[PDB]
Task: structure prediction
Amino acid sequence: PSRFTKTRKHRGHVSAGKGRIGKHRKHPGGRGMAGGQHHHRINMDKYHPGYFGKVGMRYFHKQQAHFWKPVLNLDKLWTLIPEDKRDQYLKSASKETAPVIDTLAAGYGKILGKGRIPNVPVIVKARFVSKLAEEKIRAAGGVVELIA
Amino acid sequence: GIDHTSKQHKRSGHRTAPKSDNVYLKLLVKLYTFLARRTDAPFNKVVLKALFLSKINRPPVSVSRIARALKQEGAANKTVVVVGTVTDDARIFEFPKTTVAALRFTAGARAKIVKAGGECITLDQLAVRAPKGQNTLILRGPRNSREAVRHFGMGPHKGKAPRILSTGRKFERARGRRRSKGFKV
Amino acid sequence: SAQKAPKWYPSEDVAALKKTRKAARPQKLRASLVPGTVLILLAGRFRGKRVVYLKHLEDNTLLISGPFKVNGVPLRRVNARYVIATSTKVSVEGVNVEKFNVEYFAKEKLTKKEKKEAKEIKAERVEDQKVVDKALIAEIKKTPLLKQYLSASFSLKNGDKPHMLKF
Amino acid sequence: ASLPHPKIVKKHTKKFKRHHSDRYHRVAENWRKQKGIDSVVRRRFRGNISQPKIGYGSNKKTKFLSPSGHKTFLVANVKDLETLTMHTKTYAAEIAHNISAKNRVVILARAKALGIKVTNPKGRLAL
RNA sequence: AAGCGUGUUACCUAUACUCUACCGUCAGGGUUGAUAUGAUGCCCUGACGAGUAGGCAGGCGUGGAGGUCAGUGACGAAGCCUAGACCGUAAGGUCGGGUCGAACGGCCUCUAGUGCAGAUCUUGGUGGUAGUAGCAAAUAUUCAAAUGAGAACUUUGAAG
RNA sequence: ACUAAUCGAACCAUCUAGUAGCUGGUUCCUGCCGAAGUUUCCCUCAGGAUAGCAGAAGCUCGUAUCAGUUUUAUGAGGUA
RNA sequence: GACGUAAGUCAAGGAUGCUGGCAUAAUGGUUAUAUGCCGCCCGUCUUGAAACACGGACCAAGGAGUCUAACGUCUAUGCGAGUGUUUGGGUGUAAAACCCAUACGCGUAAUGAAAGUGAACGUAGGUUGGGGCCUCGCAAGAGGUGCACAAUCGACCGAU
RNA sequence: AAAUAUUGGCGAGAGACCGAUAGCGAACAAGUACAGUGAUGGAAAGAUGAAAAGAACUUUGAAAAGAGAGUGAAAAAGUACGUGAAAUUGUUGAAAGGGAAGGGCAUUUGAUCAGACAUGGUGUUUUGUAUUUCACUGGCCAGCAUCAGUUUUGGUGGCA
Result:
């Protein structure tokens, strides 16, 4: 609200919290990112390194649809199964009856391997996968299949 | 007229009362203020000064971290006290039976703990069951893990995270960060 | 409500006083005050009247009777501080003064009902002045000029200095 | 009457007036801090007006107390007055200025019945 | 010497030092098995208190909103004046008196076009200057009668 | 020079509340703390950024990894 | 604590006892004046203002760090690996309120210029300090566990 | 076609908006008076009273107008009209006054103002039993004695 603003506490003080000799002006240092190379150079090379210059090629007509690759680590892999049926799959590890976790329809493109899934069979449906993500799945007895 | 070596009328700089308005969170402080004062147990003094911490200083403690605390030998039967919230975790799939006293439990944490055979209580049950912190164990959530801390202490050659909205190419990856253009940090 | 309420009402009970550690020790008097000496009244109706100190009451006042037939001062009590003790003395081992004490000089019992909005001596006060003065006038005659000295008042003349004047 | 109290020491009875309040009619008498970079008042020069400070703060045990020793209470009607029934010793009644005359005679009669002391009984009478 | 050089003591006084009271801040504490209006309260101890720019905290006030006091008021609201009174350190609050005529308060919160001595500030108004400067170029008016309450200024006449 | 009392570029309205590192002003109280005019860079010297000095929010602990200090011992200096 | 065999008393963790007058303008308050001393005219620029520096004849009213998009730190609250109803729909006493789906936003993974790759040897590692707890210990104190955190050496991921 | 925009026009409904220097420039005969050759610029000005019931009539004055009377709840509502602030001005009163005045500390002098306790009050025979027909104390101001804290000024004794 306005009543808690320090302006209400600054009534009566001539400079309104801006200094007698500073004389708060409109734009004493410039407008926006002005003087990024001349008189604010120390700021722009200390607090914001790397602002000025080229880097990398220019991607023409970039679409974030192509680069939609949300990552699903193996720890979260068991969140895909609804919590009601997680237990009946966590217990009774069955090779011929393994839950079919479909990561894609939940919106996950790539399976990473942050690891430590319990050693029970599991079915993983993902467009991509990392090398170590497989090995933990196989070390748990699961299999990875390719879908797109 | 005396010289003053230190700054006079210097406030102690520590929170003395929770400057939250919460009445229930002041009832707990009222209880523990009495316990901390009327007991010699250092545990009550600790929990009293942990109830005042702000939200950033009361980080969530995962039930995975609760389990890691119980992995210590001699702590299997100890109760766990978390002055703050207790959020659950999908990372752990086996949870040992235990009792946890925390300000707030997420619904996910209660379901995970109680189903695991444990039990969830608050600080007042903890006071009833153990006034002076018998066989207790205080856990604190990680504090530098906050995203606001990656940018703290920013400077050249510090390995910190610049304050920036959009992260990617064309944003702080030019002269001043790479050695090819200009210089390196 | 014009002014809502103060919750923290003060302690309406009255707290008893603490046990004060002050007794009432007997008054000690300056060496210049000896029974039968001659004082000089400083303040009151009889300022400057010479008088004879008789007895020290338990009400830390001085019972004095400048012989009423001499200086017109009755057998009355005065304050020890408001009198100057003169070196001269009158021997007084022949006067009975025991019957005069605090309750004797009690004025009267006065309340707001007896309010003298607009504005008599007891016969005892006269006879007791006589019997007390009988010893005084009998044993004051032997020393010459004292009766004249006692009759006259006292006042600071010009050119004299009360500090270097010994009384 | 009221409870026994410490002697009422005001410790500054003179009202704090603004600097040059009489000199200019536009300068209100109400005390406003002289925040001038050159004002002799703000620098506490000798022989000048004294600035309000804590030191003039009155004794707590005799703060808000009238010279009669009663903390005044602003009463509006009979119902407000009945709150001070047992609290007659400390709090003294005070009829609000806007209470009508026919509404004062009822309060004064009621207040006089309870023995609560009223500091404006000479207010808005009829003779 | 009431000058100079020197020394002896006596003495005078800072918001300095000591002690005391009071205030505020800070710190360290005490205070719940029928004990206290039930805890940002109360109480104890101690040390401090200069201050521009500046920071922060606690408060007073103004316009309006939600709630409450079954609040105040034509037997007199608001407003205004008040070398009348009280309260608060203070911002201010409250009362008493007069004018006055129709609405307005207290408290918990909410909100903002929220507090003026200044900006050669704006608008309006009023002053000292001050019954003052000024009403002095164009040669010039005078008498009488009439009208009229009133005639240097109007007529009319006579003159110039 | 003159171009409607306006002229080394008229006047009127708008863009326009043009821009200002410059001048003046910036409205209640109390309480606590309380400076700086120096480093470096800038077409920089009436201004900024950055470090410094200050406040606040605190946080971790509980007499120390301390100190505008001295002693002891051991260095260094090239002023008087 | 003292004096007292003791009972008690006391100058021992802060004043009592007695007495007198008055009970009102007496004390005191406000205000005017006088007297002693002191006080330069305020605001601002300034190293420096009473300035022979500038603004201010006086009075009333108006009058200046606001709002917003996006954020940073801090804080509070709700939920918490999720979070966000209010683009929209249903509803309604109708701009209110209530309810709701999918998406989408931020977060959960980083790195590289990009192609791409993508985080446990170990009890998620070791070492040191580490509040607290626990075992013994009357008590210090000794051990065990030691989250947060601080430093460092590691280990894994991306890039060269 | 619809979903969309709409500070113009017409109608309608609302507001945590403004309240006669505000809000449209314009609450009123406002784009009016007025200024400018012209383009254009462009104000100020709301409120008697319920009702004009708008002061008949008498008297002074030439008349305005005054004094009355009177209407009116009010003329402290008379169209120069709700309330009517300050600057500024007059009258009366009070005070002061040797080239300023004003302010602070302190007190006199004068003017003026709140208050006790004048309490059921430690009770006392009521005229066919709730008036205690004399009360306890604090309200102001002081004095004395004994003390305590701080201090000052001395007289003495003993000892080294």
Observations:
- The first helix of chain B runs from residue 23 to 37.
- Residues 7-11, 13-15, 53-54, 57, 143 of chain B lie near RNA strand F (CB under 10 Å from a C1').
